[model samples]
Target: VVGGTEAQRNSWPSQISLQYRSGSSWAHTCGGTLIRQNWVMTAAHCVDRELTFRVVVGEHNLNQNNGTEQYVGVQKIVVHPYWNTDDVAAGYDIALLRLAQSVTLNSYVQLGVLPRAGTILANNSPCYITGWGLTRTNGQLAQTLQQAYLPTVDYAICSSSSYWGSTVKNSMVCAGGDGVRSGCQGDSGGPLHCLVNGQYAVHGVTSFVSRLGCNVTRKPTVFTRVSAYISWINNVIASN
Candidate 1:
């Protein structure tokens, strides 16, 4: 994330590292939220490469072992049926991955609570975007996890001509267009945890940002509204 601070180890327990096997090692490609013991919610584009993927729970630093990580193989991937790789601006960029085995839960590893179906945050609602994405546009990934306060930018304003314009869809959540802090590459598929009713819930799946740069003015980071797909997520886990 651009202009973010190193996150506390246990600050976001549900945050996970989604990695792809590269030779003898694994590379962190994106972030995800543990929605279930064996299921993770992320962006569809993260799995577009069709590489062997794994989910690492309780992960904080990528280069060093945290001693609390739980690595699991991805058994199945279920992408949104309407998701179009060429039409990310059209929304429907969410996806779910089923793990080969259920992971253990602890202080550092737990399931992420999701917002209710159709729930929408008001303008400038309090939220944060957490990930190990770049520290700046075209910069290297952070060695540790980071988070930035990215308040919600309601759909009306985000879809305005000067803002994201028609590129911002109702199915997406816009946050942190201030050009100081935002989600970047490697942060895609991460969670946008929003505070609602005195509690925080996973309300978004990091999707995209402005092409001009990672932290561009009037181009808030866009996320797949998780509330819009509550039923789809439940159905996939139930049927699969």
Candidate 2:
């Protein structure tokens, strides 16, 4: 994330690291939310490449073994049927993954509470974009996970010509075009947590951002509206 601060340990318990195997080493590629003990919600684009993947729960530091992490191999992946890799702007960028086995839930690892179906936050509603984040100005991967206050930007304004224009859809959520804090490189598929009725719920799955820059003004980070796919998610988990 850009202009983010290190997140408190286990503050977002459902946050996870989606990693891919490369040259005998596992590298964090994206962020995901633990929707169930064995199921994860992520962006379809994160699994588009044909690389072997794993999910790490209870992780805070990328290079540090906090001894609280649980590694699980991916058993199955289900990308939204309508998802088109060539056109993320068209939406349907969501996906679900089944783990090899269910991981134990504790203080540091738990299910992400999902928003109700069809729920849409009011304009500028409080929220946070979280992930392991990109390398810093020092050209080094951040040691710990980070979070940025990314208030929601309603669809109407986000779809304006100066912003994402026709690319922003009602099925998506736009957040943090503040030109300062925003989700950035290697953090797609993470959660956009919005506090509603005094409880935090996962309302979005990180989708896309401006090509010009990670934290561009009037160009908020776009996310797959999780509330739009509640039935789809339930169906997948029920069958698989």
The per-prediction CA RMSD against the true structure, in angstroms, equals: 0.6, 1.3
Clashes of each: 0, 0
Each model's TM-score, in the order given? 0.99, 0.97
**Which residue pairs in candidate 1 have backbone atoms (N, alpha carbon, C) closer than 3 angstroms, thus clashing?**
none
- Model 1 clashing-pair count: 0
Error of 1 at 6 (Å): 0.8
lDDT of 1 by residue, 99-167 (tens): 999999999998999999999999999999999999999999999999999999999999999998898
Question: How does model 1 fare in lDDT?
Answer: 0.95
Winning model by lDDT: 1
Candidate 2, overall lDDT? 0.92
